[PDB]
């Protein structure tokens, strides 16, 4: 290397350790509300008293911020600077700071949060010392001028490099910069490391989470052509979707649902991956408000695919999980909706899974098959398995009404597959 770059690297090693007093009046004078002439003349104790003055109201809003009064907002936690500590102590400092950041990420519209984190900016240089968590916890607030102030103060990491033109700017950072920020690959590995961190800690609130799905979804919007870049984009999004569905949270569930919907509708995965998606979706479909979304997810999911075995029957674990988390009459209500969304490739696949494992509710299938105008090969492919359940399952009046409906609608289709399999008069010899 050069000497000058090898020495400007030591600026990055000691960007916060103020040695000359002008370095102090640079390093203390930037904070989240106060102008740098009044921010220059602030004693540490005076800022900590305002810190507790916002922190007590925050802890009274929810008690989880009370523990940072024990450690971070302690009255003993003023004089200690970071650079005086060992890195093993600095790691625990960063742990406290990070867990505080995703916590306060919800409460950030409050001026209590702005007055609380400004001291942490000023006591622990978290605009510089830990700026990846500062930005990742507070990324969704890109319209708010509190964040826009925060942009003029953060030493920008290479991972957040779209905003290199937006630090110390007037107008707020635009919506397209969020996509171009997220359109990088390793940025998405940071956003997994944020959201997965929020999942185990269960600090996942709705507005930021809607911003997550709107950014990830717009990423696959931007990668509609770059199918090889999309094929390295499946590992980052489907991991976030899977680890999202392990949440108790229902907004996180519909978030992972939107991820799977827009991902399958933008890029056709293999069928077995969609079966994995169905297992992870249905295996945590518990609360009510996610069911209406999650049904439409599989409605999209089975429509996103095409191949050999396009509408084949589901596995018995998958089908019994589906018929545990939904009833029959759930889908019997849903297909009679006036929205009536096109789950055409799902029904003709799921009725076969009824027709092999269960076989007990084919009056239900009659109700099902009168509801939806299906596809041409689909009805034929249902009728072949119903020929199979004519032959091997003992013939019953439910199947008689089934095939009488199938003579009422597309008798000749039945005649063609019967000329393919079996005979015509032998099907009259069925019942």
């Amino acid at each position: 290397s050069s000497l000058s770059d090898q020495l400007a690297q030591v600026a990055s090693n000691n960007a916060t350790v103020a040695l000359d007093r002008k370095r102090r009046q640079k390093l203390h004078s930037a904070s989240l509300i106060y102008n740098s002439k009044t921010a220059a003349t602030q004693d540490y104790d005076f800022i900590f008293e305002n810190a507790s003055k916002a922190l007590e109201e925050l802890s009274q809003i929810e008690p989880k911020f009370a523990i940072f009064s024990r450690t971070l907002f302690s009255e003993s936690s003023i004089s200690l600077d970071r650079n005086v500590q060992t890195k093993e102590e600095i790691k625990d400092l960063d742990n406290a700071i990070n867990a505080y950041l995703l916590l306060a990420s919800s409460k950030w519209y409050l001026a209590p949060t702005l007055h609380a984190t400004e001291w942490l900016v000023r006591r622990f240089q978290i605009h510089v010392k830990n700026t990846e968590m500062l930005l990742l916890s507070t990324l969704n607030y890109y319209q708010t001028p509190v964040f826009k102030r925060i942009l003029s103060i953060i030493k920008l990491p290479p991972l957040f490099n779209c905003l290199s033109n937006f630090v110390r700017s007037e107008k707020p950072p635009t919506a397209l910069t969020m996509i171009k920020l997220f359109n990088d690959m390793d940025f998405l590995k940071l956003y997994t490391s944020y959201l997965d961190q929020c999942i185990k800690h269960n600090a996942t609130y709705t507005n930021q989470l809607l911003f997550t799905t709107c950014c990830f979804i717009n990423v696959v919007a931007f990668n509609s052509n770059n199918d090889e870049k999309l094929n390295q984009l499946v590992p980052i999004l489907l991991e976030i979707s899977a680890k999202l569905l392990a949440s108790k949270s229902k907004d996180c569930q519909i978030a992972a649902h939107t991820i799977l919907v827009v991902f399958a509708t933008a890029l056709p995965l293999k069928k077995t991956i969609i079966l994995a998606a169905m297992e992870t979706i249905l295996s945590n479909l518990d609360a009510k408000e996610a069911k209406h979304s999650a049904l439409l997810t599989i409605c999209k999911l089975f429509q996103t695919l095409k191949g050999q075995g396009n509408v084949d029957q589901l596995p018995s674990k998958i089908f019994k999980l589906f018929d545990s988390k939904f009833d029959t009459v759930s889908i019997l209500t849903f297909l009679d909706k006036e929205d009536k969304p096109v789950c055409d490739k799902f029904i003709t696949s799921y009725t076969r899974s009824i027709a092999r494992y269960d076989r007990s509710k084919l009056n239900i299938i009659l109700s099902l098959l009168k509801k939806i105008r299906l596809e041409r090969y689909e009805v034929r492919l249902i009728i072949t398995d119903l020929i199979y359940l004519s032959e091997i399952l003992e013939d019953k009046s439910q199947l008689v009404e089934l095939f009488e409906y199938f003579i009422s609608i597309n008798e000749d289709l039945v005649l063609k597959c019967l000329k393919s399999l079996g005979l015509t008069g032998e099907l009259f010899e069925i019942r």
Partner: protein, 42 residues
Amino acid sequence: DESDSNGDINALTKILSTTYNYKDTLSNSKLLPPKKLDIVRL
């Protein structure tokens, strides 16, 4: 610590992990994908 020895929630992750190409290129789907023509000048 990490050892292998109703539906499970690891079910997406495992089937991702045993895949590298997630596009079903082994399909021969007999439908045409949009926007990208496998076309060769002869």
